[PDB]
């Protein structure tokens, strides 16, 4: 006898660090290009954007490769393309660091609510991050998906036989973690770490600055769902 029954959690940049490592890869990529191009010139013009193979580490590497070949008019040396491959390989072999307060927060939540990890990305690398994280033991239901759109979240909830009104999703993206869930009648917790359509006065949302606030926020949303 309670309103919210299930709490979902994003992976990358919610449960564990990810973007930091992609920023390191990007820094290394630009260092390679700086041997060929004047990158201190508002004039380049990437457009890594255009070459997205995907947004995961494999897609990033192929995109970095195409970009480098394009921007250097195919003058880039094979030895330096090998260095871009080593960036992706290094990014793929990154043990993920769990975000401080996350294990405590999930444990506290898992004491009163069912939980599910819903992560979009490369299946292989995401399974590796889940394993590396040590968080498997708190998540008996784990979903890796190719897209976070309303229908994918709906499909997930349909497998739990649970209406969206009894679900809270926690994530670092208003666009891909909160908005789609609101769209099907759910609740969100946003912990920031792609314009989105979330209304400035959205009542079914809390912004929680760090994971230590997630349990209180779930309970707050649960009381609201009970009154509403």
As annotated, the binding site includes: 10, 12, 172
Query: By C-alpha distance, which of 132, 55, 138, 128 is closest to 97?
Result: 132
Of 95 and 101, which CB lies nearer to a copy of itself in the complex structure?
Answer: 95
Binding residues for Mg(2+): 10, 12, 172
CB of 89 to Mg ion, least distance (A): 22
- Measured from the CB atom, is 34 or 146 closer to a copy of itself? 146
User: Residue 83 or 175: which CB sits closer to Mg ion?
Assistant: 175
Residue 10 partner contact from Cl ion, Mg ion, a copy of itself, none using kind-dependent CB cut-offs of 5 to 8 Å: Mg ion
Please classify residue 166 by burial: count the beta carbons closer than 10 Å to its beta carbon, then call 0-12 exposed, 13-18 middle and 19+ buried: buried
For residues 87-126, which are near Cl ion according to CB under 5 A? 121-122, 125
Task: Tell me the C-alpha distance between 8 and 171, whole Å.
Answer: 9
Member of 59, 163, 185, 213 binding Cl ion (CB under 5 A): 59
Stretch that binds Mg ion, among 9-17, 65-73, 121-129, 181-189 (CB under 5 A): 9-17
Residue number with CB closer to a copy of itself (42 or 82): 82
Closest separation between CB of residue 94 and Mg ion, Å?
14
What tokens appear for 118 in the block? Answer: 């819903």
User: What is the Cα 60 distance to its own chain's centre?
Assistant: 15
HSE-CB at 213 with a 13 A cutoff on CA atoms is 15
Rounded to whole angstroms, what are the CA distances from 183 to 160, 204, 209, 218? 18, 11, 23, 19
Q: Which residues contact 133 (CB under 8 A, 6 or more apart)?
A: 15, 16, 96, 98
Cβ 55 to Cl ion shortest distance, Å: 6
Residues at the contact surface with Mg ion, assessed by CB under 5 A: 10, 12-14, 172
Residues at the contact surface with Cl ion, assessed by CB under 5 A: 54, 56, 58-59, 121-122, 125
């Amino acid at each position: 006898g309670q309103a919210i029954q299930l709490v979902g959690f994003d992976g990358d940049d919610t449960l564990w660090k990810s973007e930091d490592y992609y920023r390191t890869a990007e820094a290394d990529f630009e260092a390679i290009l700086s041997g060929y191009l004047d990158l201190g010139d508002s004039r380049m013009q990437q457009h890594l954007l255009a070459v997205e193979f995907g947004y995961g580490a494999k897609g990033m590497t192929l995109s970095m490769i195409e970009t480098a070949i394009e921007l250097t008019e195919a003058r880039i040396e094979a030895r330096d393309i090998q260095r871009i491959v080593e960036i992706g390989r290094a990014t793929l072999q990154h043990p993920v660091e769990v975000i401080a307060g996350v294990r405590e927060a999930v444990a506290a939540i898992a004491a009163d609510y069912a939980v599910v990890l819903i992560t979009k990305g490369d299946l292989f690398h995401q399974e590796q991050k889940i394993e590396q994280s040590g968080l498997s033991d708190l998540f008996p239901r784990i979903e890796v998906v190719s897209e976070k759109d309303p229908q994918t979240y709906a499909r997930v909830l349909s497998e739990f036989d649970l209406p969206a009104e009894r679900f809270v999703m926690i994530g670092n993206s208003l666009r891909s973690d909160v908005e789609p869930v609101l769209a099907i009648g759910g609740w969100g917790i946003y912990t920031p770490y792609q314009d989105h359509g979330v209304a400035a006065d959205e009542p079914r949302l809390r912004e929680v600055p760090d994971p230590s606030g997630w349990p209180a926020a779930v309970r707050a949303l649960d009381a609201q769902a009970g009154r509403q």
